[PDB]
Each structure stands twice: as structure tokens, then as C-alpha cells.
Design an enzyme around this catalytic site. Structure first.
Site, PDB file in Angstrom:
ATOM      1  N   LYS A   1       0.797  -1.216   0.000  1.00 16.84           N
ATOM      2  CA  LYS A   1       0.000   0.000   0.000  1.00 16.84           C
ATOM      3  C   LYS A   1       0.839   1.282   0.000  1.00 16.84           C
ATOM      4  O   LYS A   1       0.690   2.139  -0.877  1.00 16.84           O
ATOM      5  CB  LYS A   1      -0.959   0.019   1.194  1.00 16.84           C
TER       6      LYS A   1
ATOM      7  N   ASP B   1      -6.342  -0.618   0.181  1.00 22.31           N
ATOM      8  CA  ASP B   1      -6.511  -0.540   1.626  1.00 22.31           C
ATOM      9  C   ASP B   1      -7.900  -1.063   1.983  1.00 22.31           C
ATOM     10  O   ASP B   1      -8.575  -1.646   1.148  1.00 22.31           O
ATOM     11  CB  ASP B   1      -6.409   0.914   2.078  1.00 22.31           C
TER      12      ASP B   1
HETATM   13  N1  LIG Z   1      -6.192   3.758  -1.444  1.00 19.84           N
HETATM   14  C1  LIG Z   1      -5.800   4.768  -0.659  1.00 19.84           C
HETATM   15  N2  LIG Z   1      -5.457   4.525   0.595  1.00 19.84           N
HETATM   16  C2  LIG Z   1      -5.106   5.652   1.247  1.00 19.84           C
HETATM   17  N3  LIG Z   1      -4.722   5.734   2.563  1.00 19.84           N
HETATM   18  C3  LIG Z   1      -4.493   7.063   2.812  1.00 19.84           C
HETATM   19 BR1  LIG Z   1      -4.003   7.750   4.561  1.00 19.84          BR
HETATM   20  N4  LIG Z   1      -4.659   7.826   1.768  1.00 19.84           N
HETATM   21  C4  LIG Z   1      -5.062   6.948   0.771  1.00 19.84           C
HETATM   22  C5  LIG Z   1      -5.423   7.195  -0.577  1.00 19.84           C
HETATM   23  O1  LIG Z   1      -5.447   8.271  -1.180  1.00 19.84           O
HETATM   24  N5  LIG Z   1      -5.786   6.022  -1.231  1.00 19.84           N
END
Ligand SMILES: Nc1nc2nc(Br)[nH]c2c(=O)[nH]1
Ligand SMILES: [Ca+2]
Length: 314
Positions: free
Chosen positions: A238, A257
Site C-alpha cells: 500500500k 486498503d
Molecule cells: N487507497 C488509498 N489509501 C489511502 N490511505 C491514505 Br491515509 N490515503 C489513501 C489514498 O489516497 N488512497
DNA sequence: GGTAGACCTGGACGC
DNA sequence: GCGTCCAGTCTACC
């Protein structure tokens, strides 16, 4: 009057404009949605934060993005400084053209996008973006925001003070790699990530070749860039994807996520098919990423930013 | 190659 | 007022 955070109304001569319709950008949907963690709406509809090593306040009307910069004589942002803002918001990228396209191949996207326009990606600094997201894992946006503020206050250059707010630039690699940093970060509440920050800064400066190694990944391929970042402590699939998409110009990178998993299952009835696991896992997360890329195309990460931002507003 | 559980730290529940 | 549940990365052993 000349003290505190500026407002368009209060200091008229202290604001320059840049053509930008709310259809191309919505500050209220981009700045507090977890891309950059350093912008604050100090005044209604006025966002303040550090941009290109200077403090700025931004606000918008239906067709304009009003900008003001705090450097000695208070004056208007120059044409060059404004160019820095355009670059930060990647304004050459026509968001209306992208929304049209995604909506053409994804009926559900068309639906959500109709109510969440102006969501684009910020073009961030590799270092700031790297350590900010190291702090993001298994955490929430509100908490991450405080962690990053305390981190910059304790290890970053002091810029200027507006009201009772002192702005700081993001700490350098040297500062983050200094002695006893992890211990100081723990008192600042970074939890176990304090180790990741210290360990990652040293790893970059003492094993990977320093800053040049990071700024380099930007000319490399997403596949290349992503693998390299995962080397650093605290940087999993991630975090590396967030960095590739938001700081290394890899618009096809899709951070996976809990929010994207929920969106996948609820709005597309998605399920892992090439993997055995039924839920999140290194294999399934990789599949989801490929799934979203296959659905949205080359700028899949940007489309992801729209749905993610929309999923927060709930 | 592919999983169970621990991690720091608070809000947000739920009883 | 309290014990859980939540908002990824890293390792045990498989
Ligand atoms: N997919 C994703 N997960 C995230 N976690 C965070 Br904290 N910001 C983001 C985001 O912009 N996209
Ligand atoms: Ca979780």
C-alpha cells in the site's frame, strides 16, 4: 489586519488568481482526504499549508483558485510562484477529460463522480510523501495528520508563524536519520512507526545511495519503482503504491486498503479469483490492484482517488 | 510460497 | 466509566 491568516475579503491586494473551475478542482475534497496531510482550513473555505518551501493560503470561487503566499514586503504571488501551485495540483491534466472516460467504461463511477467532481492528485515531494505514508499504515487520517505535524515541528525547518501557528518544512533525510530520532518520535506518539521512520531514513542514506536513489525512481517504471520502495522498512504494498501514485508520477498505481476493498465488494461485487484467500492478503491485494487497473486504465490511480475521497465522506 | 497474530494510538461504539 | 473494534507491515511456522 496584516496579522494572522489571510482571507480573500480581508486583504484583496494580497491574492493572485489562476483559472480553475470547481469542475477541475475542489480544495475541500482533495486537501483533507489523505493525499497530503499538511493543509488546514484555518478560515472557512481557506486552506493553509506549506507549498514548495513557502506557506500559502488557498481559496476558490466558481471559476478561480485564489492564492496568497507568505514569504519581505508582503506582495502578490509572482507568475513563477503561481506556476509552483499549478504544478502541485497538476493542472495540465484535464480532470474533465478523465472523468468522462472513466464514466464511459464504469457506470458506477459515472454515478459517484456526478456528486464528487474536482478530485485530482497532488504532485508531492518524494521525501514528504515517503515518510508521511510510512506513518499511514494501520492508522486513520485524523491521527496520521497530528503525527506528521508533530514530526515536522520537531525535525523540520521553521518557516513562519501566522496567529499561534508556526509552519515547518518537512524534515530532511539527514534529520530523520539522526541519532535518537526513533525515541523522540515515540514520545510524539508515532507508535511502532517511529522505528520505520528512523530505520528508513538511514537505509536510504546509508544503503541505497541517498536522495538520488529516490528522485531516480521517478524516471523508472511503476513495476521498478514499487519493488524498490518495498525494500525500505515499514513500506509494504500500500505505502509503496501511495508513493508511486502521489510522488513518483505513476498514475496507474492503485493503493489497496480497507476502503478500496469495501468499494470493490460493495460497488462491483468483486471477489478474488486467481487467489485462494477470501480476504486481504498479499496475493488478493495484488489482484484488486490489477482489477482496478483493468477497469480504469492508465490513470487508474486517479480514478481511485475519486472513489476513495467519496468513500471518506460517509 | 502463503497465513495467523502482535503491533502504537486514540475515537467510536456498545452494554 | 471499560473492553472491543478500527483506521498495514513484518514474521512465526507451514
Ligand atoms: N487507497 C488509498 N489509501 C489511502 N490511505 C491514505 Br491515509 N490515503 C489513501 C489514498 O489516497 N488512497
Ligand atoms: Ca485493518
Amino acid at each position: 489586519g496584516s496579522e494572522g491568516h489571510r482571507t480573500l475579503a480581508s486583504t484583496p491586494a494580497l491574492w493572485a488568481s489562476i483559472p480553475c473551475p470547481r469542475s477541475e478542482l475542489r480544495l475541500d475534497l482533495v486537501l483533507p482526504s489523505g493525499q497530503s496531510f499538511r493543509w488546514r482550513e484555518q478560515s472557512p473555505a481557506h486552506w493553509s499549508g506549506v507549498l514548495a518551501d513557502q506557506v500559502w493560503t488557498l481559496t476558490q470561487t466558481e471559476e478561480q483558485l485564489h492564492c496568497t503566499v507568505y514569504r519581505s514586503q508582503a506582495s502578490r504571488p509572482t507568475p513563477d510562484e503561481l506556476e509552483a501551485v499549478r504544478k502541485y495540483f497538476q493542472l495540465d491534466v484535464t480532470l474533465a477529460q478523465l472523468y468522462h472516460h472513466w464514466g464511459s467504461v464504469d457506470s458506477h463511477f459515472q454515478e459517484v463522480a456526478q456528486k464528487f467532481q474536482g478530485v485530482r492528485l497532488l504532485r508531492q515531494d518524494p521525501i514528504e510523501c515517503l515518510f508521511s505514508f510510512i506513518c499511514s499504515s494501520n492508522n486513520n487520517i485524523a491521527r496520521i495528520t497530528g503525527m506528521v505535524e508533530r514530526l515536522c515541528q520537531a525535525f523540520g525547518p521553521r518557516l513562519i508563524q501566522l496567529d499561534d501557528v508556526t509552519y515547518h518544512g518537512f524534515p530532511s533525510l539527514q534529520a530523520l536519520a539522526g541519532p535518537e530520532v526513533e525515541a523522540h518520535l515515540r514520545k510524539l506518539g508515532l507508535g511502532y512507526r517511529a522505528r520505520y521512520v528512523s530505520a528508513s531514513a538511514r537505509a536510504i542514506l546509508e544503503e541505497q545511495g541517498g536522495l538520488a536513489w529516490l528522485q531516480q525512481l521517478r524516471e523508472s517504471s511503476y513495476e521498478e519503482a514499487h519493488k524498490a520502495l518495498c525494500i525500505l522498512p515499514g513500506v509494504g504494498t500500500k505505502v509503496a503504491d501511495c508513493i508511486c501514485l502521489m510522488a513518483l508520477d505513476k498514475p496507474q498505481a492503485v493503493p489497496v486498503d480497507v476502503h478500496m476493498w469495501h468499494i470493490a465488494q460493495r460497488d462491483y461485487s468483486w471477489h478474488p479469483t486467481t487467489s485462494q484467500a477470501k480476504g486481504p492478503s498479499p496475493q488478493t491485494n495484488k489482484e484488486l490492484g490489477n482489477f482496478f487497473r483493468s477497469l480504469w486504465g492508465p490513470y487508474a490511480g486517479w480514478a481511485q482517488a475519486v472513489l476513495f475521497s467519496a468513500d471518506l465522506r460517509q
